[PDB]
Amino acid sequence: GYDYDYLFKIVLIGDSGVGKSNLLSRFTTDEFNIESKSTIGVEFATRTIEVENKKIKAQIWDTAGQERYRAITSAYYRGAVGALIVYDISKSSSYENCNHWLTELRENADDNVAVGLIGNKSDLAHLRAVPTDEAKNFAMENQMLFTETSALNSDNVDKAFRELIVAIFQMVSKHQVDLSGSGTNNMGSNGAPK
Amino acid sequence: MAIETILVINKSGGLIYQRNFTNDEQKLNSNEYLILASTLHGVFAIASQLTPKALQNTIPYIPYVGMDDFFKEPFTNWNKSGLRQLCTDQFTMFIYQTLTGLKFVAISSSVMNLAIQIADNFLRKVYCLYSDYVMKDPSYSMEMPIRSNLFDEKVKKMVENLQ
Amino acid sequence: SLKAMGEEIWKNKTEKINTELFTLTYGSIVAQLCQDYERDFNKVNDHLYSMGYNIGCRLIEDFLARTALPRCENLVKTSEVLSKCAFKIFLNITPNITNWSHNKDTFSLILDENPLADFVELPMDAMKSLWYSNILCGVLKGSLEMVQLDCDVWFVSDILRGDSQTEIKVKLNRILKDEIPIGED
Amino acid sequence: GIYSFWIFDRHCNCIFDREWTLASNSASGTINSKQNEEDAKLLYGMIFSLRSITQKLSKGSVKNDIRSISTGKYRVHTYCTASGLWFVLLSDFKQQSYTQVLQYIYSHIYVKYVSNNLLSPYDFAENENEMRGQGTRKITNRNFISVLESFLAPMV
Amino acid sequence: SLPKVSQSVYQMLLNEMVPLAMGIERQISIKRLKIEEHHTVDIIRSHNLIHELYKADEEEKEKVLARLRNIGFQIGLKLSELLIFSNNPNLKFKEMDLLLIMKFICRDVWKQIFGKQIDNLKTNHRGTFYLLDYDYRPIQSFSLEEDAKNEELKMIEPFLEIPVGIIRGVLSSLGYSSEEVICLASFIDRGVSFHVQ
């Protein structure tokens, strides 16, 4: 059937050409029967983990920037609870508007979100457009999880997703107690009197 | 008119309920329904933004669907710049947005304007069962699939009372 | 199903005589290529193929305009519609379907009569160097790719050179795709 | 009656787009320059996504395609030919499916005056790899536009 | 009556021996390519092949226009015997007059290629017979861009060199070689013109 317990939606946001979609395909189920990207914009991918003996279903919506869909993207951040700003260390002008993406996403997403920040294409570490310690600091006074992804090793990004779903889980972890259902008696022949 | 599959999607994209009624087939694996529901939310967003030189009254009635019933009087809708009904050869898809933002999708295996009139008086009677049997449910958190088992055979009786 | 609708299109279509025209026209434009090259015959096949391509690519939209047909995918459906409502609508003839392959791929297209080589006698210097009706391979190769297939066609034998029939051995090699409407962001 | 008329090719390009500013018997429009291309990208992606989800949801053997998409205000009407050439048409209410008119255009105007025109092409592509969605070219044939504005003009 | 095939494949065959004429002259052996069974064939299509005649060297264009009337010559002098077997009464081979074979051609050839008569015929009595038809059949469907109507008549001018050859062929069936010219000659209400020599 379906049988999962919770379902989160997590946007991937950034500038175009920073390498979000190639980052998405390697670590998660992909190319199921999705028509494509740009036909409607913002492709959807799914990931199924379990936390604390609860099953979690996560939908990742890699936002697409083409200027034409800018009005459409606003409506797609409505209700968005998990977030990931991706930036590349090779090019440098994405980091000038990474703060703008954070501002636009603090606006009209939820009451509270948990935004990660991830450096794609660390295979070109020598070509470092921005120092990692500055982005690490900018994550530190913005309450953000910070990652550096090789794009050739998927362990880092997979670890980031597991910890992000943990922090967003405890945030919404509704209290649960028990569903045991063992209390049985009263098998008589009913000498009733009304 | 007829309904063959209830789909209930969230106010934030991905679905919270679907139950194929007497489909007798599983063309789509359960996972696909999520990308279908998000695709319908996206094209419901896109069909707002294109509108021609317009910028200018959806009043249903009581047809006695389901056999006291749920309401008596003509009412209004809430979405104008948005997708309302798809029409194809095998099926016909109705959709109904509530005011709060909670879209209800009904796939219909009976094809070929009065189908809107009979359709939304069923899709509000599924909204009344939603607000009566899922909202008063402390095991049901917000933003979670509808894991209640009373909601299934409260709507199965009304749809087999239809068809 | 189909053969009723084929005669139904043979009741509202503009017609003219197939004798005394059109065999004249196709034979005149193969006599020009016979004399234009200057009596060489293995080159006229590779010009009539390249002319039949361009005449087939525009014919396919007329044929989809006359009869409302979906995009054919398997070689049951293309082989049914070519034998029943393409050649019947355009040329009043119908072929038959023999020599079927393994794995539903490559078939033959034996033509019973032929209103392109009709009443033509072919001279002795082209017994083993010419294909006469090789505008038909042009229209099939340039018409079947425009419903987003990809094929290959060739004549195998002909009545003019050989007692065996006129047949085209059409091969499915691959099916092309639909392309996604941008490269990327 | 008719707001707009559009064509889309196999290679994902809007090539004809008659818009009616005030509708009526006659109006102004057909400026691809004034964001008509942006509207075409939205119109195409909508019909491509719904055409993609119809083939996953289609039982039977002959798979179906979109016949109309309503909204609360207007309608979208489609005729998707097998050669990948899509007639979409945005209309009003109070009248049924325009599929007869939408195949009349294909059987008496497009094949009469574009595909059997042999001065101008049928591909409508300059012939590059920047023709996948990203190039813009228009047939613009004089007799085509005259009879196509002539025929739709009683439907105000 | 007779066995018949469809007009829409014949008219579309009849439109395009002019791309065949430039593909036979220019290709003596942006151009494209295709393949067959361990081969290739280099292809060029019609929109990028009539437009090589708007940029034509003058001996090349006049070398092409002999071939169009040569096609028309072969189909005319092959057509005339079968139209004789249709009926063709009451005329002779040397044929001392000319109007009785101009009554022949508009009623008997031009119905079998185009379905109607040459509806006007003017008689200069020294032997220059004007044959005028108003709506010529294969040029029912050709138009240029948004009011660029000057540059399309000189663009489309090879397409009238088939009925140069038709009336050369049906008169070389009756004896001799003549001299022919063409005109456009627009109508008076809702054109083309041919001479005799």
Side-chain angles (χ1 to χ4, degrees), chain A residues 1-178 181 183 188 191-193, chain B, chain C, chain D, chain E residues 1-142 148 150-189 191-197:
Chain A
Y2 286 95
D3 66 48
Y4 46 84
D5 268 10
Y6 292 166
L7 187 153
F8 303 125
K9 67 182 291 294
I10 295 171
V11 286
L12 294 174
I13 190 181
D15 276 2
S16 158
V18 310
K20 41 182 84 154
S21 314
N22 43 297
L23 172 65
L24 181 62
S25 42
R26 309 168 319 116
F27 91 109
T28 190
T29 84
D30 202 30
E31 293 177 350
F32 4 96
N33 263 97
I34 10 189
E35 2 101 271
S36 216
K37 197 184 184 183
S38 112
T39 144
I40 222 48
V42 196
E43 140 209 355
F44 331 101
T46 53
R47 177 68 180 272
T48 150
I49 69 157
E50 84 296 328
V51 191
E52 275 170 82
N53 304 57
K54 298 293 188 71
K55 186 118 99 45
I56 299 299
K57 185 51 134 346
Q59 219 180 357
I60 324 124
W61 296 27
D62 45 302
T63 335
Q66 258 144 99
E67 251 46 63
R68 92 143 171 274
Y69 277 143
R70 209 39 102 260
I72 278 326
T73 66
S74 157
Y76 280 43
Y77 314 109
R78 190 67 53 167
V81 69
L84 265 171
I85 306 196
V86 60
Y87 85 114
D88 55 332
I89 62 170
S90 305
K91 209 190 81 204
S92 178
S93 66
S94 65
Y95 203 80
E96 181 294 334
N97 86 318
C98 262
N99 34 82
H100 136 263
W101 288 130
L102 194 63
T103 313
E104 190 276 331
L105 183 62
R106 282 301 198 280
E107 207 160 68
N108 74 353
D110 207 357
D111 62 357
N112 189 359
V113 293
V115 183
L117 187 75
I118 176 163
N120 203 24
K121 291 176 221 141
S122 64
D123 206 83
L124 279 335
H126 57 326
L127 318 210
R128 210 137 94 211
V130 177
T132 76
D133 303 271
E134 206 271 338
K136 191 160 142 59
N137 176 80
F138 176 62
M140 287 207 159
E141 67 272 14
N142 278 98
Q143 299 96 18
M144 294 177 71
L145 150 63
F146 175 65
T147 129
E148 179 234 77
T149 288
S150 178
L152 62 80
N153 156 73
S154 226
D155 184 1
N156 165 253
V157 56
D158 270 289
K159 291 174 65 175
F161 210 49
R162 259 288 317 179
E163 293 177 350
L164 182 59
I165 305 180
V166 175
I168 208 178
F169 183 49
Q170 269 104 94
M171 210 154 78
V172 316
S173 275
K174 242 74 243 107
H175 213 108
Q176 244 323 290
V177 164
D178 201 333
Chain B
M1 293 182 286
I3 315 289
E4 76 165 349
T5 290
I6 300 298
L7 183 63
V8 173
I9 63 170
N10 218 329
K11 61 187 74 175
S12 84
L15 74 164
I16 58 176
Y17 184 45
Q18 69 88 13
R19 197 68 74 229
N20 304 98
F21 287 141
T22 339
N23 270 44
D24 309 324
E25 120 113 296
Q26 324 281 315
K27 9 98 223 73
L28 258 0
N29 335 98
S30 92
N31 138 83
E32 319 279 304
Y33 281 89
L34 282 71
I35 69 170
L36 188 153
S38 296
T39 300
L40 275 296
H41 165 59
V43 298
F44 190 73
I46 281 175
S48 73
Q49 210 195 349
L50 62 84
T51 293
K53 288 339 79 243
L55 293 295
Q56 204 350 286
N57 349 130
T58 85
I59 302 311
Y61 72 81
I62 177 175
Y64 203 99
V65 186
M67 158 61 196
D68 214 7
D69 42 356
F70 282 2
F71 35 80
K72 300 289 94 175
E73 184 178 1
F75 50 89
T76 178
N77 215 33
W78 292 300
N79 51 347
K80 311 300 205 331
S81 61
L83 191 143
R84 184 177 177 87
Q85 169 201 26
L86 190 149
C87 181
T88 61
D89 292 331
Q90 315 287 332
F91 55 89
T92 284
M93 211 205 67
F94 306 104
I95 191 167
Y96 170 47
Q97 201 194 47
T98 60
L99 183 57
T100 62
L102 204 44
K103 288 171 259 291
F104 288 86
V105 185
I107 287 172
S108 179
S109 185
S110 284
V111 299
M112 294 299 291
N113 191 82
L114 277 296
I116 303 297
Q117 308 291 324
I118 312 159
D120 291 331
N121 306 333
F122 180 71
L123 276 296
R124 198 193 153 197
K125 289 191 181 196
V126 69
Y127 183 40
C128 202
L129 294 193
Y130 170 68
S131 66
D132 210 10
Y133 278 60
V134 176
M135 291 285 78
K136 314 164 187 146
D137 202 322
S139 81
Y140 172 74
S141 163
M142 294 296 172
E143 302 325 329
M144 176 172 154
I146 303 299
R147 280 290 104 203
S148 158
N149 67 318
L150 212 57
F151 194 40
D152 286 325
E153 51 274 49
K154 282 299 272 172
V155 66
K156 276 181 183 275
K157 300 289 94 176
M158 182 178 71
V159 64
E160 302 149 46
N161 271 4
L162 189 137
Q163 79 190 4
Chain C
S1 159
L2 286 177
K3 203 166 266 184
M5 182 265 317
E7 162 47 10
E8 175 172 291
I9 301 301
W10 265 116
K11 279 300 291 299
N12 50 350
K13 181 67 174 66
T14 180
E15 321 167 344
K16 64 91 177 179
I17 318 292
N18 47 56
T19 195
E20 66 183 1
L21 277 297
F22 184 43
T23 61
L24 267 72
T25 316
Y26 184 69
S28 168
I29 61 186
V30 75
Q32 187 63 248
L33 276 296
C34 176
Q35 75 96 24
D36 224 350
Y37 276 174
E38 292 84 4
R39 263 280 299 101
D40 172 81
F41 287 135
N42 54 339
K43 216 169 302 181
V44 296
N45 313 280
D46 298 345
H47 198 86
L48 284 182
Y49 201 46
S50 159
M51 191 284 258
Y53 204 80
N54 190 179
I55 208 178
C57 289
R58 295 163 163 268
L59 183 62
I60 193 56
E61 316 180 6
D62 206 316
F63 158 70
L64 276 296
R66 293 258 52 88
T67 181
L69 294 184
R71 192 176 309 195
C72 295
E73 291 143 352
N74 49 353
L75 276 296
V76 176
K77 192 41 75 188
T78 44
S79 187
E80 172 93 338
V81 66
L82 278 178
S83 66
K84 290 187 74 179
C85 294
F87 281 135
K88 164 67 162 153
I89 277 171
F90 283 144
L91 288 180
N92 215 20
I93 70 156
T94 187
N96 275 320
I97 313 294
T98 76
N99 268 6
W100 185 259
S101 158
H102 63 87
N103 76 22
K104 301 290 95 176
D105 274 349
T106 62
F107 71 102
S108 66
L109 204 45
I110 49 160
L111 293 161
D112 313 328
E113 77 269 37
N114 195 12
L116 279 171
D118 204 352
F119 292 103
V120 191
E121 191 35 75
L122 194 144
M124 187 66 204
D125 45 352
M127 294 298 103
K128 278 179 178 54
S129 45
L130 187 153
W131 288 114
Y132 189 73
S133 308
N134 191 359
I135 205 178
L136 273 172
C137 289
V139 307
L140 294 175
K141 175 62 159 273
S143 179
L144 288 198
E145 61 86 20
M146 274 305 294
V147 289
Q148 275 266 26
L149 276 75
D150 194 286
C151 295
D152 263 337
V153 297
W154 58 95
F155 270 98
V156 180
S157 79
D158 198 286
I159 300 283
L160 307 160
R161 26 175 284 173
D163 192 77
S164 66
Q165 293 82 17
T166 54
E167 86 280 39
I168 314 171
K169 187 177 158 85
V170 53
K171 161 176 84 80
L172 183 64
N173 62 6
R174 42 186 307 274
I175 286 185
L176 272 154
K177 265 76 64 181
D178 173 339
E179 69 275 16
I180 292 298
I182 194 66
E184 68 153 3
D185 45 354
Chain D
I2 295 298
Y3 288 121
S4 178
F5 179 73
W6 315 64
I7 312 281
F8 296 103
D9 295 11
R10 187 163 31 93
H11 286 243
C12 316
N13 290 309
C14 167
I15 63 150
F16 186 63
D17 60 357
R18 168 73 195 140
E19 334 271 288
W20 301 69
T21 32
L22 50 121
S24 311
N25 35 279
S26 43
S28 20
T30 77
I31 317 125
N32 252 119
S33 118
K34 284 190 9 211
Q35 248 53 63
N36 248 173
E37 84 282 303
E38 238 67 68
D39 203 18
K41 282 150 205 178
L42 245 76
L43 229 349
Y44 191 74
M46 184 181 288
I47 310 303
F48 188 50
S49 295
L50 295 163
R51 188 194 160 90
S52 72
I53 63 170
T54 317
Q55 291 163 357
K56 277 196 301 220
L57 204 45
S58 192
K59 318 155 187 83
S61 304
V62 297
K63 52 164 197 303
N64 49 346
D65 183 298
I66 317 291
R67 281 211 282 192
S68 80
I69 296 147
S70 165
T71 61
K73 277 299 191 49
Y74 62 94
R75 288 176 190 267
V76 185
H77 280 284
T78 47
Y79 180 45
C80 283
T81 46
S83 74
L85 188 153
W86 307 7
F87 288 79
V88 309
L89 173 82
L90 322 179
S91 66
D92 290 330
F93 291 166
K94 68 181 178 67
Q95 194 60 34
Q96 281 280 81
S97 81
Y98 290 166
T99 191
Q100 301 306 109
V101 183
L102 272 169
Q103 52 196 58
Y104 183 79
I105 291 151
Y106 197 53
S107 66
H108 269 105
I109 296 89
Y110 185 75
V111 298
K112 183 65 148 297
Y113 293 129
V114 177
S115 76
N116 292 5
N117 185 8
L118 184 164
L119 303 169
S120 92
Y122 53 100
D123 275 320
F124 315 136
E126 310 260 60
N127 288 293
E128 302 78 1
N129 296 114
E130 67 274 15
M131 291 334 296
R132 184 176 179 179
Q134 59 264 38
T136 149
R137 214 228 167 247
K138 244 198 126 100
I139 5 111
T140 172
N141 308 356
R142 151 191 71 87
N143 45 5
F144 179 82
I145 313 298
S146 87
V147 68
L148 191 42
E149 301 215 289
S150 161
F151 180 54
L152 310 165
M155 290 95 65
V156 309
Chain E
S1 297
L2 277 296
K4 293 182 183 292
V5 294
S6 186
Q7 212 271 346
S8 314
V9 71
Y10 180 60
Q11 160 196 333
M12 183 179 72
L13 175 60
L14 190 69
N15 294 340
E16 61 88 22
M17 302 146 268
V18 193
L20 172 68
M22 192 84 108
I24 193 48
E25 172 150 337
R26 179 65 65 192
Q27 180 258 350
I28 61 170
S29 69
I30 180 73
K31 324 312 211 163
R32 303 151 201 61
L33 191 143
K34 64 165 292 302
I35 48 173
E36 68 267 17
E37 274 69 40
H38 187 273
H39 295 285
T40 189
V41 160
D42 292 331
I43 50 175
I44 191 65
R45 66 180 65 88
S46 304
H47 62 58
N48 191 359
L49 209 62
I50 310 175
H51 287 85
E52 275 193 6
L53 188 153
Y54 182 76
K55 291 141 54 208
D57 170 39
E58 199 39 66
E59 64 98 18
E60 183 94 355
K61 178 169 187 163
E62 266 315 294
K63 197 167 296 173
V64 175
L65 299 198
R67 213 159 274 110
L68 277 171
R69 54 176 71 92
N70 170 237
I71 300 299
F73 203 49
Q74 274 299 111
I75 190 167
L77 72 84
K78 276 164 180 299
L79 173 54
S80 169
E81 285 92 15
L82 277 296
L83 300 190
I84 278 161
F85 263 50
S86 80
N87 51 350
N88 190 359
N90 52 33
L91 61 94
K92 277 74 69 177
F93 164 64
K94 181 68 176 177
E95 163 46 27
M96 72 291 291
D97 62 357
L98 282 72
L99 183 62
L100 192 40
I101 62 171
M102 295 299 103
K103 201 58 211 65
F104 159 72
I105 172 172
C106 65
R107 206 163 188 97
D108 291 327
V109 188
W110 185 259
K111 205 185 292 313
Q112 302 313 70
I113 318 176
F114 311 113
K116 56 170 165 49
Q117 287 70 240
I118 305 163
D119 62 358
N120 203 357
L121 167 49
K122 192 49 211 171
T123 318
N124 170 44
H125 280 50
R126 274 84 58 197
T128 306
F129 280 76
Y130 270 68
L131 287 173
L132 282 72
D133 184 328
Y134 283 131
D135 51 52
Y136 178 44
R137 175 72 48 88
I139 321 291
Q140 207 66 32
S141 308
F142 299 137
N150 189 359
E151 68 196 9
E152 62 87 19
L153 278 297
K154 216 166 179 307
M155 187 66 203
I156 193 166
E157 90 175 324
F159 280 14
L160 285 186
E161 318 267 5
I162 295 303
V164 159
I166 301 299
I167 63 171
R168 281 176 181 260
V170 299
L171 292 201
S172 165
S173 71
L174 308 187
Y176 36 81
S177 80
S178 169
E179 170 55 76
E180 266 318 295
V181 285
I182 61 170
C183 319
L184 277 296
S186 74
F187 43 71
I188 62 170
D189 54 334
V192 76
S193 301
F194 324 110
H195 291 51
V196 311
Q197 273 308 115

